[PDB]
mmCIF file of C-alpha atoms in Angstrom:
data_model
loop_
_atom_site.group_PDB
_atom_site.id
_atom_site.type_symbol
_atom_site.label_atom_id
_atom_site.label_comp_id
_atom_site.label_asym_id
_atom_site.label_seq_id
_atom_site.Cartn_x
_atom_site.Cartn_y
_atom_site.Cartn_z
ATOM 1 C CA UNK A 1 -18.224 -104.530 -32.717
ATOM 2 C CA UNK A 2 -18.543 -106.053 -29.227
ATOM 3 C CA UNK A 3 -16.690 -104.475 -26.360
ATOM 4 C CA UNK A 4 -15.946 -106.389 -22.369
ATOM 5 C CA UNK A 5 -14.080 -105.931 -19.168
ATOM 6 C CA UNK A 6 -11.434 -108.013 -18.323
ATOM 7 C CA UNK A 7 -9.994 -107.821 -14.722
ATOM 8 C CA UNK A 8 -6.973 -109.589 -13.576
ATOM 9 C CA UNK A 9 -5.571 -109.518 -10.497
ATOM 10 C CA UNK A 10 -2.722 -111.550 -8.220
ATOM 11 C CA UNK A 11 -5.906 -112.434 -5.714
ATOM 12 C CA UNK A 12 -8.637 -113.724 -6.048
ATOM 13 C CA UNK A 13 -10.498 -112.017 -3.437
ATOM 14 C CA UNK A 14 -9.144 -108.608 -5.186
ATOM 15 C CA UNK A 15 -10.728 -109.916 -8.286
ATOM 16 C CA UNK A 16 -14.206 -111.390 -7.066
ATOM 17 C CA UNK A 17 -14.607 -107.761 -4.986
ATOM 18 C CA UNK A 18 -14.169 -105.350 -7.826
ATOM 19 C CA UNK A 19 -16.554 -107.329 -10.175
ATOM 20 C CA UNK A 20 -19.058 -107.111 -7.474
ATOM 21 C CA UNK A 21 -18.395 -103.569 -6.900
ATOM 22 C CA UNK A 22 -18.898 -103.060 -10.783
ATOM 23 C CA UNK A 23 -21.800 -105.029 -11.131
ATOM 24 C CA UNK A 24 -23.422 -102.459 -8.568
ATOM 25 C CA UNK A 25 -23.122 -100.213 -11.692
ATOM 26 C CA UNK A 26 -22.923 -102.352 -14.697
ATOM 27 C CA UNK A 27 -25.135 -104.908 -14.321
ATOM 28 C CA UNK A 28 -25.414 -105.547 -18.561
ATOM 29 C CA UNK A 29 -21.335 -105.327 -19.610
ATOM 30 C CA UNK A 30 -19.982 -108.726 -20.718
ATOM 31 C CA UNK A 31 -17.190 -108.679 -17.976
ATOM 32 C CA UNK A 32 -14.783 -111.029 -16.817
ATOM 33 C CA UNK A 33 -12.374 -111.448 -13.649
ATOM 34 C CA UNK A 34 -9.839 -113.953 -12.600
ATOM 35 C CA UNK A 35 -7.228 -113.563 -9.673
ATOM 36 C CA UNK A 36 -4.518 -115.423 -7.808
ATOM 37 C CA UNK A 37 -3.509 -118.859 -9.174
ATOM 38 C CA UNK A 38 -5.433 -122.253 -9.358
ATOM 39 C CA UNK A 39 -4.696 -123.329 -6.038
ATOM 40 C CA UNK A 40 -5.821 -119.647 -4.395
ATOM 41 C CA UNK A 41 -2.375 -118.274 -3.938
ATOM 42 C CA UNK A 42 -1.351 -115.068 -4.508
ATOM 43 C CA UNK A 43 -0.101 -115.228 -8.578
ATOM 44 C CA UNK A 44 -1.276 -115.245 -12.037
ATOM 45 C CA UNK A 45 -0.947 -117.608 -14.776
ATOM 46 C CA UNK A 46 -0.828 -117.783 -18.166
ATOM 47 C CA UNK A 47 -4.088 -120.551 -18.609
ATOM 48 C CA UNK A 48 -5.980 -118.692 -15.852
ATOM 49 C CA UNK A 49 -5.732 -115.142 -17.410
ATOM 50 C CA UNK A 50 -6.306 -117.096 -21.043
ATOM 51 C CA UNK A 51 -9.768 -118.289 -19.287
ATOM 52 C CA UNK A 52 -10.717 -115.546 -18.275
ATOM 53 C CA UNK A 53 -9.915 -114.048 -22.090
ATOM 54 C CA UNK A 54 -12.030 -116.939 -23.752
ATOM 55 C CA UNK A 55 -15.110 -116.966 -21.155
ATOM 56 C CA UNK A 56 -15.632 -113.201 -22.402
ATOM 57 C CA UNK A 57 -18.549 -113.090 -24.605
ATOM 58 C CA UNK A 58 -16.853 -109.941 -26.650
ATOM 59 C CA UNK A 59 -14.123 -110.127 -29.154
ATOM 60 C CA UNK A 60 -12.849 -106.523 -28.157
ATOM 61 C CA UNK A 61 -11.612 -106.715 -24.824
ATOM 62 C CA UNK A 62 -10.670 -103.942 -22.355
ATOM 63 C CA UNK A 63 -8.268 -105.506 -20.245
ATOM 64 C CA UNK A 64 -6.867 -104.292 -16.540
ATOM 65 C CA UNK A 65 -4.708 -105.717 -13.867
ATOM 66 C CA UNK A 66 -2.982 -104.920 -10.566
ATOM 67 C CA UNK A 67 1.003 -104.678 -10.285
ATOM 68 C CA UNK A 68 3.531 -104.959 -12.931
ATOM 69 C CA UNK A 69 3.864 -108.647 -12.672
ATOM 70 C CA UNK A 70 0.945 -109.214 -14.454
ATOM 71 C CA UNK A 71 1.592 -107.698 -17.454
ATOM 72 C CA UNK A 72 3.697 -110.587 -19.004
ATOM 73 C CA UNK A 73 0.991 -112.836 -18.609
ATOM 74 C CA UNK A 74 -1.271 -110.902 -20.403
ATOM 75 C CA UNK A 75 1.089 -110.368 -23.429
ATOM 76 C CA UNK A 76 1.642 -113.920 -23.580
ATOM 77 C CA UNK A 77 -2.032 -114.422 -24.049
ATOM 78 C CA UNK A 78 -2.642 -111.626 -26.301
ATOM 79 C CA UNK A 79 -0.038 -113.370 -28.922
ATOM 80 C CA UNK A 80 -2.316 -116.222 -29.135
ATOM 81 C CA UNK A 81 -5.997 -115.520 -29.232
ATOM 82 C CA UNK A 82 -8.395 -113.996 -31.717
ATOM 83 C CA UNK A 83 -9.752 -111.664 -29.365
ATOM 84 C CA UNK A 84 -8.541 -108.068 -29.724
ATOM 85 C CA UNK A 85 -7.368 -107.564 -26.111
ATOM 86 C CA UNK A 86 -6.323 -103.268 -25.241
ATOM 87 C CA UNK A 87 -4.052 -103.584 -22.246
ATOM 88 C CA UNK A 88 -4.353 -100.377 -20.426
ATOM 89 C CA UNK A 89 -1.307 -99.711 -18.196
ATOM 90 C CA UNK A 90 -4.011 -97.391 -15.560
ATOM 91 C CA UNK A 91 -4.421 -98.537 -12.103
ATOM 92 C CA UNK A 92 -6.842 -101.889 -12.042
ATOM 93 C CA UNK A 93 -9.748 -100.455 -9.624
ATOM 94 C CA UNK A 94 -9.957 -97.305 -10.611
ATOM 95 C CA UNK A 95 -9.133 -98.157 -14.319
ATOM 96 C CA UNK A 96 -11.890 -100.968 -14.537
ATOM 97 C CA UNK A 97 -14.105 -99.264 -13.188
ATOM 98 C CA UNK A 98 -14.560 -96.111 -15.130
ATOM 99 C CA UNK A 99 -13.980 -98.217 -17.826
ATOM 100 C CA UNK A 100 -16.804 -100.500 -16.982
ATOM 101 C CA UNK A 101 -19.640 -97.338 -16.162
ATOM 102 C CA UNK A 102 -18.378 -95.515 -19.239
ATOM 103 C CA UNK A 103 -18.997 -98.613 -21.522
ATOM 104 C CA UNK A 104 -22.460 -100.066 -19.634
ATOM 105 C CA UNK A 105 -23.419 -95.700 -20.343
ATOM 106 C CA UNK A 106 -22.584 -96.613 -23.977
ATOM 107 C CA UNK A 107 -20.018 -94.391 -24.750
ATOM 108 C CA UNK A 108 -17.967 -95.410 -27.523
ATOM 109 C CA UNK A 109 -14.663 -96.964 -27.611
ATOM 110 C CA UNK A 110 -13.024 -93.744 -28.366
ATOM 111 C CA UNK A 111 -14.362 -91.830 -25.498
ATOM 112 C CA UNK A 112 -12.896 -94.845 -23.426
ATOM 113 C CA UNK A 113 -9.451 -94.710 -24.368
ATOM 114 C CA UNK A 114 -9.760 -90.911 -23.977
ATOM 115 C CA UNK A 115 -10.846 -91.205 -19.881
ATOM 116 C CA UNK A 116 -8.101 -94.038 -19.219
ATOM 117 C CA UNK A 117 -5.560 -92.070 -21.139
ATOM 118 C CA UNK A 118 -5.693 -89.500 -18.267
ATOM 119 C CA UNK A 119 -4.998 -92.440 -15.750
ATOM 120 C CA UNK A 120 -1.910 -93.692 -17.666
ATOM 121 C CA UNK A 121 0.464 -94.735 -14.465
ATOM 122 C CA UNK A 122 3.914 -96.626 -14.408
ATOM 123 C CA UNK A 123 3.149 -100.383 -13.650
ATOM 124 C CA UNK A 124 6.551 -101.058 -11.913
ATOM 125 C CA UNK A 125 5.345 -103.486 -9.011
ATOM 126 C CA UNK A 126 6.158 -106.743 -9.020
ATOM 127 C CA UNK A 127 5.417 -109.715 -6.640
ATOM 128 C CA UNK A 128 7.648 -112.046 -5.601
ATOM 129 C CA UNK B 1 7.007 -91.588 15.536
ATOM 130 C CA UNK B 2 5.647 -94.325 14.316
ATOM 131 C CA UNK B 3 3.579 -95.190 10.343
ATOM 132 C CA UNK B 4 1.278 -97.525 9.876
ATOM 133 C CA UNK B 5 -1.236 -98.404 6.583
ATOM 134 C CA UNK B 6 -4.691 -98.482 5.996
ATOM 135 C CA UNK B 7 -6.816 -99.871 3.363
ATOM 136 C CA UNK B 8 -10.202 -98.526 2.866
ATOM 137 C CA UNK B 9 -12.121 -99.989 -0.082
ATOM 138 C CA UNK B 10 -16.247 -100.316 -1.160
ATOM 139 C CA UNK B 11 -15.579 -104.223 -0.753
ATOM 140 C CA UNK B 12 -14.833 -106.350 2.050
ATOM 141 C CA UNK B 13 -13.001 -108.702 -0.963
ATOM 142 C CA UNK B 14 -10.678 -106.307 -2.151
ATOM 143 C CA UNK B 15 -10.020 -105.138 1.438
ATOM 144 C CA UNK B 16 -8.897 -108.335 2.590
ATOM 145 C CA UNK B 17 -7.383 -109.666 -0.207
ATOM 146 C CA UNK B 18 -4.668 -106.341 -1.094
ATOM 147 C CA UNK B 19 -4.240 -106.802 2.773
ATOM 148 C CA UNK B 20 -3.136 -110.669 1.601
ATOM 149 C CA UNK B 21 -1.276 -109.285 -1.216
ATOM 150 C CA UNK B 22 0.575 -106.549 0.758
ATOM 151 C CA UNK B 23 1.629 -108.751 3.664
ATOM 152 C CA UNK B 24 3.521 -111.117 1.176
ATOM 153 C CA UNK B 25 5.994 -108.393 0.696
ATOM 154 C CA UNK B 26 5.410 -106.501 4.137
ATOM 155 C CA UNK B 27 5.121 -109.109 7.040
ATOM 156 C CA UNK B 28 6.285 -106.385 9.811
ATOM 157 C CA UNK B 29 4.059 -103.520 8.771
ATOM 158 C CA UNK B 30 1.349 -102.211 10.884
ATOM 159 C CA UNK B 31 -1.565 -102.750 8.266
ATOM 160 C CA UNK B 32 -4.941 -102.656 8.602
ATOM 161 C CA UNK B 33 -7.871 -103.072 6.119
ATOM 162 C CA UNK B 34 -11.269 -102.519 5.728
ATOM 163 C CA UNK B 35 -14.279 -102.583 3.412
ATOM 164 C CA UNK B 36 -18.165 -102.931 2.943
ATOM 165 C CA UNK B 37 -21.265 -101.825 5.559
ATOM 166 C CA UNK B 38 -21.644 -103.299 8.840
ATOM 167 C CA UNK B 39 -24.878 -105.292 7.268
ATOM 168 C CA UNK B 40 -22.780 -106.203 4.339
ATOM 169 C CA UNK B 41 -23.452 -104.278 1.383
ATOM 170 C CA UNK B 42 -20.812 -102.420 -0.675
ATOM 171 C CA UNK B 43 -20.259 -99.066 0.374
ATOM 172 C CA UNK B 44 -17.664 -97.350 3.587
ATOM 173 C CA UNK B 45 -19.198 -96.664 6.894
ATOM 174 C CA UNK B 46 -17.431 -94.468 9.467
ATOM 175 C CA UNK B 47 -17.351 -96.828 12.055
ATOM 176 C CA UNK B 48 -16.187 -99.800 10.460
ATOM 177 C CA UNK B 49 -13.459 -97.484 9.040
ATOM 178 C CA UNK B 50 -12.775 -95.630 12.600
ATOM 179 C CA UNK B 51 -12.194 -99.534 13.764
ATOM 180 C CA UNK B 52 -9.778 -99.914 11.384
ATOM 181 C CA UNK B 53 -8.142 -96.691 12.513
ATOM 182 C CA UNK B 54 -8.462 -97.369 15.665
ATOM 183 C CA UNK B 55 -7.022 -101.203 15.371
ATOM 184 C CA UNK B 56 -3.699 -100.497 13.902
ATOM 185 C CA UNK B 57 -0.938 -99.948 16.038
ATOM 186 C CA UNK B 58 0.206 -96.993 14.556
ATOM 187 C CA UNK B 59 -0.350 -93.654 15.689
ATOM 188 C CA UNK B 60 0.775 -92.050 12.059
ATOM 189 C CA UNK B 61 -1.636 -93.541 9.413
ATOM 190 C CA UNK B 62 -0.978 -93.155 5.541
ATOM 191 C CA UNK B 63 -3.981 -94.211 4.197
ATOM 192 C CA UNK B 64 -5.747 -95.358 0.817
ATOM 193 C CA UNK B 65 -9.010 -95.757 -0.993
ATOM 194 C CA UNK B 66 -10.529 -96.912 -4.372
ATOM 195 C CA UNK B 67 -13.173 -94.612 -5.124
ATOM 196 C CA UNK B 68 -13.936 -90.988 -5.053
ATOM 197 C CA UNK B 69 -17.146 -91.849 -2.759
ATOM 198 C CA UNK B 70 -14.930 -93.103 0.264
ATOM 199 C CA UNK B 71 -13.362 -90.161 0.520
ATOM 200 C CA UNK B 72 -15.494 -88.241 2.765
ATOM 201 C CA UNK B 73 -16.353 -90.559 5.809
ATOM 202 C CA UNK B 74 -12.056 -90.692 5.585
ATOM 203 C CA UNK B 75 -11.931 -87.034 5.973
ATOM 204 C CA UNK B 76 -14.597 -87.468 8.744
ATOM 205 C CA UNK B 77 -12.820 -89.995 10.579
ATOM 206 C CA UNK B 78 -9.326 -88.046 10.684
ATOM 207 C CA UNK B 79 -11.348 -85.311 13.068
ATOM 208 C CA UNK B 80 -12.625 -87.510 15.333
ATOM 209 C CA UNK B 81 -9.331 -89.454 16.013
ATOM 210 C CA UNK B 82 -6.146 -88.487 17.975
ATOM 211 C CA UNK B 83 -3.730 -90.611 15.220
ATOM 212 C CA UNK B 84 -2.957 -88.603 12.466
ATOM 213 C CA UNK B 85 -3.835 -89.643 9.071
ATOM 214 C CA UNK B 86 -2.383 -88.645 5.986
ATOM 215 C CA UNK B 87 -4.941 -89.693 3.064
ATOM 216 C CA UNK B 88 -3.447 -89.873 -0.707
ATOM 217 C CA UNK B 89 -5.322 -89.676 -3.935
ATOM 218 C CA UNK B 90 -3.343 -92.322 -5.675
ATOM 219 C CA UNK B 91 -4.622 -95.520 -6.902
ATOM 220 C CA UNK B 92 -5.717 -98.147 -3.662
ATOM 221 C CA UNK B 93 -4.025 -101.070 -4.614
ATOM 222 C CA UNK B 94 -0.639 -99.727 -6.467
ATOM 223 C CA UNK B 95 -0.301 -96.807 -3.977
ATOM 224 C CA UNK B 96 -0.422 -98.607 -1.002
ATOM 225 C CA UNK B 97 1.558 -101.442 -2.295
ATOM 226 C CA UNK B 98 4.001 -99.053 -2.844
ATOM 227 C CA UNK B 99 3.825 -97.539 0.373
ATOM 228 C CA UNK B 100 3.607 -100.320 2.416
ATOM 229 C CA UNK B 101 6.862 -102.432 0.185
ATOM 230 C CA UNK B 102 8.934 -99.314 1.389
ATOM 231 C CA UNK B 103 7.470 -99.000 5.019
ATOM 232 C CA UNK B 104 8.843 -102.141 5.653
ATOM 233 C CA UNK B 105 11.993 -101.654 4.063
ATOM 234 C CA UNK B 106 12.371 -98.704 6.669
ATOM 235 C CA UNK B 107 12.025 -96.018 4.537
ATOM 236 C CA UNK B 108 11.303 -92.591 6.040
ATOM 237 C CA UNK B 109 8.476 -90.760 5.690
ATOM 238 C CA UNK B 110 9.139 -88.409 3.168
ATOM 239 C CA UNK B 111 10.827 -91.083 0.757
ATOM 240 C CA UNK B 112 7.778 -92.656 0.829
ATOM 241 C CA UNK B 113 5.081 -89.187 -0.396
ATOM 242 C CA UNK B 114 8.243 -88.893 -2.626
ATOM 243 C CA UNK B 115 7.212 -92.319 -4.350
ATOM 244 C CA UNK B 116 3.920 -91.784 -4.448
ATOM 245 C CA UNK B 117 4.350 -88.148 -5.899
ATOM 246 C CA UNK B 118 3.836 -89.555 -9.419
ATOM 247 C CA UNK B 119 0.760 -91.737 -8.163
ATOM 248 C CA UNK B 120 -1.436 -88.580 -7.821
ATOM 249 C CA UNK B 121 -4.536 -89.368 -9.651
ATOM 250 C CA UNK B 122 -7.847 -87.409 -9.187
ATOM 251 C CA UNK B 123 -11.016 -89.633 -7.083
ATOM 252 C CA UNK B 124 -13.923 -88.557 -9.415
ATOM 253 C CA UNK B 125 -15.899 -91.847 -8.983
ATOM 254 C CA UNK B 126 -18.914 -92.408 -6.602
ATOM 255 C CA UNK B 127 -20.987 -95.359 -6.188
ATOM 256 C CA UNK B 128 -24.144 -96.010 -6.418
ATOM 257 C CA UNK B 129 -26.146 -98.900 -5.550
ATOM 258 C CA UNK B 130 -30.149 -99.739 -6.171
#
């Protein structure tokens, strides 16, 4: 089965820095990242997070993002698309990241889910 | 006594745009963020993070990171400053969201570590870079 990252965040410069600083470590992950809306403001949006969804070479897709605010979007996009997205409610740096070493190690899907279960957070903030 | 936030991250990007992020709900705040080398790659320095430090107008600093790695030059920093920092291992971006959204609502001190109480994570993750 394939496996990917997906990062989303309400910025784009948020986004852009944390693939970089994954890449550092994961250099052969299929791994995606979209932030802020199409004009650069701060924001997410249903055809921007569905992009970055669809650009994602894998069809199993680990999927992180920043406040609260963000999590409709993604629900919205995992009704409609093939892919099997897991939306892990862990904090987006942190999160992605050990998600993105573990998986470029090659440890199993399983073992995944186990490390971001301990990071389980409440995703109550919301932009305005 | 007055609080200010910093952000420390690996990446000048993620520095500057939670910074962005933040100051959409927390114009007021004393905020200041940093991230990367002085020559650009991704990592923390001391100085660039004492600068930060130093730059913010507060003299009571409750300050964040991303990864496990940053961690130390923070702890480093704290000695060789007069401002007194209080570092929390919760996530960077939620946890000082968090922080700085009731900072500039004027909430007190402890109101705020009481917020971030359930934030606690453990900072296990170091960089590397070849």
């Amino acid at each position: 089965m394939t496996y990917g990252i997906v990062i989303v965040s309400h910025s784009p410069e948020i986004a852009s820095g944390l693939k970089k600083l994954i890449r550092e470590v994961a250099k052969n992950i299929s791994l995606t990242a979209i932030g802020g809306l199409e004009n650069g403001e701060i924001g997410t949006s249903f055809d921007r997070v569905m992009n970055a969804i669809e650009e994602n070479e894998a069809d199993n897709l680990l999927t992180f993002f920043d406040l609260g605010s963000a999590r409709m979007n993604l629900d919205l996009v995992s009704e409609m698309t093939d892919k099997e997205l897991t939306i892990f409610n862990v904090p987006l740096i942190e999160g992605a990241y050990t998600a993105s070493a573990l998986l470029e190690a090659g440890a199993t899907f399983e073992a995944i889910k186990e490390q971001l279960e301990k990071m389980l957070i409440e995703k109550r903030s919301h932009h305005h």
